[PDB]
Amino acid sequence: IHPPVSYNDTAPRILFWAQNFSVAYKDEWKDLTSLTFGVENLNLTGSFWNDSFAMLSLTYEPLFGATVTFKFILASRFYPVSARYWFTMERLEIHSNGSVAHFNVSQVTGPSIYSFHCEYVSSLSKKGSLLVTNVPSLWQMTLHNFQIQAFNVTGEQFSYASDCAGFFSPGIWMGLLTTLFMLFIFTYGLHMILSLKTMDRFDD
Amino acid sequence: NNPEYSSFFGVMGASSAMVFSAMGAAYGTAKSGTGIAAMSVMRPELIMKSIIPVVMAGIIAIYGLVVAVLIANSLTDGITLYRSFLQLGAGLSVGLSGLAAGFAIGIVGDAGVRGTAQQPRLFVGMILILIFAEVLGLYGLIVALILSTK
Amino acid sequence: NNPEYSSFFGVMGASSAMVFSAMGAAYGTAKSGTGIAAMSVMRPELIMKSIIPVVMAGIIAIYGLVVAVLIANSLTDGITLYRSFLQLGAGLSVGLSGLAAGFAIGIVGDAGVRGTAQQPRLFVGMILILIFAEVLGLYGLIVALILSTK
Amino acid sequence: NNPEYSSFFGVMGASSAMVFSAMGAAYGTAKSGTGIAAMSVMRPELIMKSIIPVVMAGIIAIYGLVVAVLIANSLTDGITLYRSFLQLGAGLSVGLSGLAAGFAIGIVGDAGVRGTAQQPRLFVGMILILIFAEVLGLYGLIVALILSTK
Amino acid sequence: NNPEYSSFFGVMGASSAMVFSAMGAAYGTAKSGTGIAAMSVMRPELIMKSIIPVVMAGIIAIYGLVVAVLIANSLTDGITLYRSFLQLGAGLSVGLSGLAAGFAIGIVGDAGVRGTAQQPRLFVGMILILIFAEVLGLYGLIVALILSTK
Amino acid sequence: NNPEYSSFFGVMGASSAMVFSAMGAAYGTAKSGTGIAAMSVMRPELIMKSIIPVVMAGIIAIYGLVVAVLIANSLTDGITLYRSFLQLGAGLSVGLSGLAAGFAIGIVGDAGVRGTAQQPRLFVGMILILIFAEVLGLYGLIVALILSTK
Amino acid sequence: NNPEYSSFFGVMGASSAMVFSAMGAAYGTAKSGTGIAAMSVMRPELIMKSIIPVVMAGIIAIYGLVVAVLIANSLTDGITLYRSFLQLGAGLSVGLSGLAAGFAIGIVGDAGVRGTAQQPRLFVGMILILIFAEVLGLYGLIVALILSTK
Amino acid sequence: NNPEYSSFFGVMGASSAMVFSAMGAAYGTAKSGTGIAAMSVMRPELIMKSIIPVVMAGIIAIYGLVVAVLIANSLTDGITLYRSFLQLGAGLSVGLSGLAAGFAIGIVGDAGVRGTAQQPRLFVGMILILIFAEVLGLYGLIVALILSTK
Amino acid sequence: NNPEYSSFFGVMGASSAMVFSAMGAAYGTAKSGTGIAAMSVMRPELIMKSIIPVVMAGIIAIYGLVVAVLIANSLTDGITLYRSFLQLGAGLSVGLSGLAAGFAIGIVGDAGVRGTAQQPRLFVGMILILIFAEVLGLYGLIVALILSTK
Amino acid sequence: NNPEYSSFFGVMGASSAMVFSAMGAAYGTAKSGTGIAAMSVMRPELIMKSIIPVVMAGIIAIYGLVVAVLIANSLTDGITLYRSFLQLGAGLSVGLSGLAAGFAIGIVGDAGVRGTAQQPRLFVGMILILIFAEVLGLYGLIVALILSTK
Amino acid sequence: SPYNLAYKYNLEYSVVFNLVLWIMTGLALAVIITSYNIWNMDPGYDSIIYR
Amino acid sequence: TGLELLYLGIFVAFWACMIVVGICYTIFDLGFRFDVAWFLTETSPFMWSNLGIGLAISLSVVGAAWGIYITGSSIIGGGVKAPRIKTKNLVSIIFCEAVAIYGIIMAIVISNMAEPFSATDPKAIGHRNYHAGYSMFGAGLTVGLSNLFCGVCVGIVGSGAALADAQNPSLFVKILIVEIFGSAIGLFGVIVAILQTSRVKMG
């Protein structure tokens, strides 16, 4: 079993894990899994943490003929509605031989007391497509069984997790609020049609 | 750009326009038909005059068809949710209005036919009362046309 | 890009097309056949002419078959959700319209047949009203063909 | 490659293919059989003719069987959701259409036997009406044979 | 490898095969027994013959037993979720088809027993009806044996 | 290791075994006791023989007890989910089969005792009818013993 | 550590032991109490003997009390989720079994009291019928005592 | 520390204790008050004596009040969740048991009063049966005292 | 500190105090005012004496109003979630106890007034029984005052 | 600033204030109107005196309008979630209180006019009972102002 | 498990869940309704039902 | 009976799940799910709007349909023995049509206030757009259901007038007052629906 990458500052503060971590530049996929998880040499230069902000920096020497770094950037806003610190990863950054690329990750959020887990975080269409690009890019990315926690961590172990995928999603919830409405309308229709009867008698 | 599912609502609009109008026309034809049968035994000469609530129930199915076709021609893979929900609003506005108007035509038909059998003076009034129920069908169609063309 | 799951809605099209049309034609055959049987003790000569309701109920199931088969013969692996929801809406639109047409055929067949045995003049009226019932199955077919060929 | 849970919908196909057809043939046999027994009180000879609605109800159970077998023999661990949905659709289409047929067989078998008790001319009409109920199972079968082998 | 929360479906199959078949045999006994009792008042000699619809209902429980025991010996810790769904399918397919046979048996039993006392000829016809109910259990057994050993 | 909630399924087995068997035996007792009570007025001699339906309804509850005890003595905190679901399957299997047997024993208790009072020749027949209801409890038990044991 | 919600299933155990037993005792008291009151006019002397079904209904509420108290005595904030499921199972096991026993005592009591007034001989029978109802509360208790002490 | 929602279940404890008890006492008073009103017509003498069920039904409101007050005065922001589940368990254990007792008092009070109109000796029997009804509130109080102070 | 959604429960308290007491007082006025009208035809003198059920039904809506105003004055833009639940509790506990009291005032009022028309001696008993009904609103008010002020 | 969806609950408040008051005023006017019209054939002078239940039903429509105007004019996209909930409460409070009042007004209006035309002395009592129906709308209004203006 | 990794609930779980839930609701209703209609037919044996 | 036990069976099974689900998400500490804030943001404002428009017509037409057939079937029935019925009592149908007219007036207004967004994130959609969506829903629901009730009422009391007029010619003129009070309900269902719509704008 692969160990989570753990960022330690007097105690463990950020945890990151995947069943697979891979990336591509110009469609050339590279597996980073064996270059990452449990690797004692794993370069975390410029990783950072604060009570309400976090940056896991993952750096590598051979990828795409360059030193490359990923910054996983997370916040712990106080969501006033629920009076709890919901966290979010609002962006990823990729720093290259001389430039930066970015993604917006959509759904990565939960209360700070819990990790977040998703079966995919990726830019690739079939793998949830959570990494939206607002402009065209040479980068593509996939985290498989992505699990992250950057606040309220205890020990080199996650707390419980908000799974990304629930019993409902937009197209389903809107699909039901139509369907479990027009099926009521159909039953009113069918009640009147099934109430149809005919006389057992006729005049002379 | 638009969601993968986006076209579903507009398709349910096209379907509901036909399905609910067919339900309304079916009831309207079933009640009027029963009326005709149980009138005709006593007043056979009144069949050809009394089919009126049946053709009108048939016209409430046509109001659904008009919208169902007009929605179906307006669909595409890339359709924005805006146009797709306008088409679903059109689908209810004709469809359930046809279901409503069809019930009034069915019941007023079944009364009107069995009334006219005993009282020839009803035959103008029955058709005035039915034309009000057909206009309820237009009050579906008209907005469903307006929505589909928006 | 084409998602998984997508062929389900198109399949429920090809199902609903047949299922709700068979329910329409079953009800239409059940009431009509009750009418013919309970009638034909008195007027055996009217058995053959009184089959027509049952034949038109049969036609509603054929419209269900035609759409179900047309959808089935145009399902494919990795179908876009667009064509698949069109196939759902087509299958409902025939299936539930044929269901409604079936209730009309059933009620009109039973009232018209038992009425015709008392009064032969009803027969021409019954055929016209059965056409106004049966055409609801054709409207469900026209919309289903349109949707299933976009 | 393909998901676990994929076989579930195809198994609900084989289940629905059999369960709803057996429910159909059971209704058809129940309603027809109670009719036959009640009829025989007046008529000692008509039993071996009046069995035929039960035999056609028996055929509906065989349609469910045919599809349920074809589905069950098609399923494997690795099966794609596409063939699985097609197998759900097949099983529902034969299942619920065989149910619709069985509903009509029960009602027209019972009415047809009761009328035949008072009036032997009805037997020919009863067979014709019953063929138009039984063929709904066959349309269910045709769609389900297409879908399960698509 | 295999998930847990997985043998549950195959276990609900093992239970369902017995529970629904017991419900089928229970309705098939409850109506048939009411028939035999109500009948015996005027024709005591018929009891040892008119028990048949009850014996047939007892065979529907035995079809449930055979599949429920087969599944209950086919299960294992960590069974592949595919075989767990097949056994759920088998368990519903014999269970609810047995329930359908039980409904048919219960109705034609209660009618046919009463009828046999008023009409001594009916007894042969009644068995030939009941065979077409009891075989719905056998069709549910067939598919359930296929699925549970697939 | 097992998840913390593991014993929930197994205990719902122990409860369902008892509860549904008690609901079965209660219904069997309620209908039987109404039958005995009504018939004691008309045939006072038969009251001691007429208890048999109630004794059998009582025996159905014993099947619920046996399986509930076996589940409860098997159940422990460290139970793997496999054994826990098997215990729910066992407990529903006897429980709802005992309910079905209860339904059957109840209806045939009432009709069997009433018929026996009107016609003492029914008594031996009623025992054989009741055995074919009570055995559903035993088939529920046989499956539940297998599932809870192996 | 044990989840803080773990006591919820324990207190629902205690509640269900009480509540459903009181529902059973209430129904058993309400039906039998109607029977006594409606009987009193014809046989005033039978009131003091006729209380027995009412007393046995009261006893079912005592079974629920006992288990609800035993559950309550065993609760703690730190309770391991395993023990709380046992307490729910015990609670439902006595509580719904007592509902079943109470249903039987109600039906048997009302029939048993009204019968006894027309024929005193029934008493010797109906007390034994009532024993075979009331023992369901005892089996529900026995299971609930076992479960709530594993 | 202790969960923010915790006091919600304690509030539902207090509320249920009063609400379901007021529904129980309302039913008790409504049915018995009807019986008194109907009985009074030919019995000016019994009107005061007959209030027994009505006032006794009021007790269930007070047991509901006792627990409701006992819970309500025990609430705090800091409540340990375990204490809130004890308070729900209590509030249902009285509240729904009071509903059960109120049902029994309503039915028994109505019948007992009418029977006492017919036969004045029933007055003692009515009191005794109403005690076996009323104690179901009291057992619900006992459990709710134990739970609300565990 | 406190959730923005927190006041939602406390608002449902203020609402439910008035809503369910209005329903209770409406039914209490509707049921008894039907009885007063029916009575007055025979006994024009009893109209002014017979109003009292309606007056007590009004008083139940006043208990609703009392808590509804007490809560609506207590609400604030940042209310501690504890106090918000206590207010929901107060609202339901007066509101549904008011409903129950209104049911009792309704039933007792109708029966009591008609009975009084046939027997003027009932008036005394009717008032006492009506106070035992109307006080259920007052017991709900007690708990609601406690919870809203705790 | 405020949450994005905040205004939704307040909008449902404005709708519920009207919709449930249209339900209440409709039933109150419809039931009263059937009374007025059916009555008036027996007493053609009493229509004017008998309009008052309809005017009371119009008054509870005004209560729904007044609150729904106040909510609708208080609403904005900038609205804080607290006032969006107070408005939901005001809307349910007036809406369902007006519903309760309307239900009562309809019942007592109809029974009141029907009684009055048999016995004109009822009129003075009918006005008072109608005031105690309509004032529930006024208590709904009072609460709904005290919420929505906060 | 050594790290408290989540229960791995897949993407499209709402889709599988709603497909299963609504297909099983539809099939449960079509069974229950059909079962009710067949359970409670009038067997209509009028010439003997009174005897 | 049957369909009422099916509607009740579904209704009880639904609320029996919802009590259990609401308890479960409370006690398991899962208030981060059941995110009503998520439901009310990701459900498109165009869905709430177009259900509102569709119900504004169709429920008004359902109320006017019962309006028509309740009065109409009495007009026909009385008309056999009293031919005078078939003209004067038609005003009750005109008020049922007026309840549908109130539907279409209001729904055309709301429809002709809808416009496309060109954005899909709840922050970018923003409060004005949400408030348009929810307001057009509640307004369209309020005219729709208020006309539903109003039309059934005017139907009922129109049979009122017709069955009374059939027995005495004078009664219709006085009974007509209740139809006016019935008709006002649909007009209240317009006035408020205008106010609920009157401040919205999408973009």
Curated annotation (Swiss-Prot), chain A:
N-glycosylated. Coiled coil: none annotated. It comes from the Eukaryota. Residues 187-204 are cytoplasmic. It is found in: Endoplasmic reticulum membrane; Endoplasmic reticulum-Golgi intermediate compartment membrane; Cytoplasmic vesicle, Secretory vesicle, Synaptic vesicle membrane; Cytoplasmic vesicle, Clathrin-coated vesicle membrane. Expressed in brain (at protein level). Glycans are attached at N8, N20, N43, N50, N97, N104, N152. The chain crosses the membrane at residues 166-186. Belongs to the vacuolar ATPase subunit S1 family. Accessory component of the multisubunit proton-transporting vacuolar (V)-ATPase protein pump. Interacts (via N-terminus) with ATP6AP2 (via N-terminus). Interacts with RNASEK. Interacts with TMEM106B (via C-terminus). Accessory subunit of the proton-transporting vacuolar (V)-ATPase protein pump, which is required for luminal acidification of secretory vesicles. Guides the V-type ATPase into specialized subcellular compartments, such as neuroendocrine regulated secretory vesicles or the ruffled border of the osteoclast, thereby regulating its activity. Involved in membrane trafficking and Ca(2+)-dependent membrane fusion. May play a role in the assembly of the V-type ATPase complex. This is V-type proton ATPase subunit S1. It comes from Rattus norvegicus. The gene is Atp6ap1. The chain holds residues 248 to 451 of 463 of the full protein.
UniProtKB/Swiss-Prot annotation, chains B, C, D, E, F, G, H, I, J:
GO terms for biological process: negative regulation of autophagic cell death; positive regulation of ERK1 and ERK2 cascade; positive regulation of Wnt signaling pathway; synaptic vesicle lumen acidification. It is a multi-pass membrane protein. GO terms for cellular component: clathrin-coated vesicle membrane; membrane; proton-transporting V-type ATPase complex; synaptic vesicle; synaptic vesicle membrane; vacuolar proton-transporting V-type ATPase, V0 domain. Keywords: Cytoplasmic vesicle, Hydrogen ion transport, Ion transport, Membrane, Synapse, Transmembrane, Transmembrane helix, Transport, Ubl conjugation. One of its GO terms (molecular function) is ubiquitin protein ligase binding. Gene3D superfamilies: lithium bound rotor ring of v- atpase (1.20.120.610). InterPro entries: ATPase_proteolipid_c-like_dom (IPR002379), ATPase_proteolipid_csu (IPR000245), ATPase_proteolipid_su_C_euk (IPR011555), F/V-ATP_Csub_sf (IPR035921). The record marks E134 as: Essential for proton translocation. SUPFAM superfamilies: F1F0 ATP synthase subunit C. The keyword Ligase does not apply. Its main location: membrane. The chain crosses the membrane at residues 6-28, 51-71, 88-109, 127-147. Residues 72-87, 148-150 are lumenal. Residues 29-50, 110-126 are cytoplasmic. The keyword tRNA-binding does not apply. Expressed in brain (at protein level). V-ATPase is a heteromultimeric enzyme made up of two complexes: the ATP-hydrolytic V1 complex and the proton translocation V0 complex. The V1 complex consists of three catalytic AB heterodimers that form a heterohexamer, three peripheral stalks each consisting of EG heterodimers, one central rotor including subunits D and F, and the regulatory subunits C and H. The proton translocation complex V0 consists of the proton transport subunit a, a ring of proteolipid subunits c9c'', rotary subunit d, subunits e and f, and the accessory subunits ATP6AP1/Ac45 and ATP6AP2/PRR. Belongs to the V-ATPase proteolipid subunit family. NCBIfam families: V_ATP_synt_C. PANTHER family: V-TYPE PROTON ATPASE PROTEOLIPID SUBUNIT (PTHR10263). This is V-type proton ATPase 16 kDa proteolipid subunit c. It comes from Rattus norvegicus.
Curated annotation (Swiss-Prot), chain K:
The chain crosses the membrane at residues 13-33. Residues 34-51 are cytoplasmic. This is Renin receptor cytoplasmic fragment. It comes from Rattus norvegicus.
